[PDB]
A paper describes a structure:
NagB1 and NagB2 proteins as SBPs for chitin oligosaccharides. Binding experiments of the recombinant NagB1 and NagB2 to several oligosaccharides using differential scanning fluorimetry and surface plasmon resonance confirmed that both proteins are SBPs of (GlcNAc)2 and (GlcNAc)3. The structures of NagB1 and NagB2 were classified as subcluster D-I and contained two α/β domains connected by a hinge region consisting of three strands, with the substrate-binding pocket located between the two domains.
The crystal structures of NagB2 in ligand-free or complex forms with (GlcNAc)2 (NagB2/(GlcNAc)2) and (GlcNAc)3 (NagB2/(GlcNAc)3) were determined at 1.2 to 1.8 Å resolution. In the crystal structures, the bound oligosaccharides were confined at the binding sites in an extended conformation and were well defined in the density maps. In both (GlcNAc)2 bound structures of NagB1 and NagB2, the first GlcNAc interacted with the tryptophan residue Trp213 of NagB1 or Trp217 of NagB2 and formed hydrogen-bonding networks with surrounding residues. The second GlcNAc unit formed a CH/π interaction with Trp292 of NagB1 or Trp296 of NagB2. In NagB2, this residue was substituted with Thr65, but the spatially closer Arg373 played an important role in recognizing the second GlcNAc.
Residue numbers in the entry: 46 to 451
The structure:
């Protein structure tokens, strides 16, 4: 016929995501108004739970939601090759969207597009300029030695230097910082070779990154309470003024600028991960990695509703509102930058544009079992439960096991 009901899986569940959810609901309402009979049932799920358990299990059963928050790289590759992702090339051409995205490479398998980035990301250090000034730092550190000097000065003032919430199942929050440490010590191509068999987690330059990560914790630069706080609590420690910096993705800018929760809005700056002097200088972790994918097991009315949702979500107006009102870097070209953008906003753009290149997050490049093994391992590493050497050996074992199976 007919009238259809589609499940829309999203991860915009936290109070710091109210903006993003409201924009999604606004898009949904517009789609329902122009497609009679089409109804969307929003299913909000925690980020780790959707990506690593719920959607993973649904896809193993071959029964994903019709619409779901999806990650580029390994996740998209697995579900595309299992045949559970709608190919989007023809929809994009029909909607005149074929040429409008900055980068679809993470969502592309054998030339076919299997999901659409909602936004871009970078990762970097948010920092409190007043807490820095209290400790004698007057500039954001550009180099690693400038960075450790800042950490020393902060610790000497009994200021918690680096907030980080890596407890419970939020090991990925530690991996954001690890992520960029081992690209800085080993270079961006090192993480590309793990899945290829051409580099190893045990390579000395990679191990060096994890040595430095542990040392940040041992010296008290990473919050001693890192394993006692969930991701969002680590975030809150920074934006309530209780620690001097925070390594996080640009989706976090909203939380940090939130009027009701942030005490630091007049005193926040940003700097890229500092230069160590190897193959990763002046690079930035970033890309277009996260957005919506669609089930391939659709009847014609489902396909019509899915096309209309894509039409109404991936539009310059919706992208510009996410940028101006939720600080989410556009995934589409041609989005004008809003008026009176906060200093923080100006700093993150300068950080992105002046980078010589971006490198993706490692979880775009390695299988899910490898990712979750690292998550568990860095929590151990920061808890006195694992040495840097034992971590890299553990990682290369699961890497070999993943490469052999695939
Ligand atoms: C469009 C957007 O900004 N989505 C955000 C997600 O990217 C982000 O998830 C994290 O993204 C990183 C970069 O792709 C991944 O390395 C990281 O593994 C991933 N974290 C998880 C738990 O999946 C989430 C974080 O809550 O926020 C989204 O809004």
């Amino acid at each position: 016929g007919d009238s259809v009901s589609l499940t829309l899986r999203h991860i915009n569940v936290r109070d710091t995501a109210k903006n993003t959810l409201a924009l999604l609901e606004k898009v949904v309402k517009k789609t329902e108004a122009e497609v009679p009979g089409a109804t969307f049932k929003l299913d909000g799920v925690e980020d780790t739970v959707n990506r690593d358990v719920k959607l993973k299990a649904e896809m193993a059963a071959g029964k994903p939601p019709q619409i779901f928050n999806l990650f580029g790289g390994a996740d998209t590759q697995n579900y595309a090759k299992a045949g559970h992702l709608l190919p989007l090339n023809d929809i994009l051409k029909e909607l005149g969207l074929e040429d409008k995205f900055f980068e679809l490479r993470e969502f592309t398998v054998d030339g076919k597009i299997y999901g659409l980035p909602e936004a871009g990301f970078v990762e970097g250090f948010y920092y409190n300029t007043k807490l820095f000034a209290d400790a004698g730092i007057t500039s954001a550190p550009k180099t690693w030695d400038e960075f450790t000097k800042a950490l020393e000065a902060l610790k000497a003032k009994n200021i918690t230097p680096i907030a980080l919430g890596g407890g419970s199942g939020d090991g990925w929050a530690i991996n954001m910082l690890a992520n960029s440490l081992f690209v800085a010590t080993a270079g961006p191509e090192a993480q590309e070779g793990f899945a290829k068999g051409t580099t190893k987690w045990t390579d000395p330059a990679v191990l060096d990154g994890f040595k430095r990560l542990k040392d940040l914790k041992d010296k008290g630069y990473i919050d001693p309470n890192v394993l006692g706080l969930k991701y969002s609590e680590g975030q809150a420690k920074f934006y309530t003024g209780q620690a001097a910096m925070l390594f996080d993705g640009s989706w976090a800018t909203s939380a940090i600028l939130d009027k009701d929760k942030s005490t630091v809005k007049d005193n926040v700056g940003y700097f890229r991960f500092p230069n160590i002097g190897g193959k990763g200088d002046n690079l930035i972790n970033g890309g277009w990695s996260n957005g919506y994918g669609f089930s391939s097991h659709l009847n014609d009315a489902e396909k019509k509703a899915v096309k209309a949702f894509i039409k109404n979500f991936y539009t310059l107006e919706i992208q510009g509102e996410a940028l101006g009102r939720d600080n989410r870097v556009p995934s589409m070209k041609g989005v004008p930058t809003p008026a009176e953008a906060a200093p923080l906003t100006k700093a993150i753009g300068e950080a992105q544009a002046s980078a010589k290149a971006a490198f993706p997050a490692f979880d775009a490049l390695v299988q899910p079992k490898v990712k979750v093994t690292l998550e568990q391992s860095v929590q151990e590493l920061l808890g006195g439960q694992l040495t840097p050497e034992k971590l890299v050996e553990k990682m290369q074992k699961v890497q070999d096991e993943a490469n052999a199976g695939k």
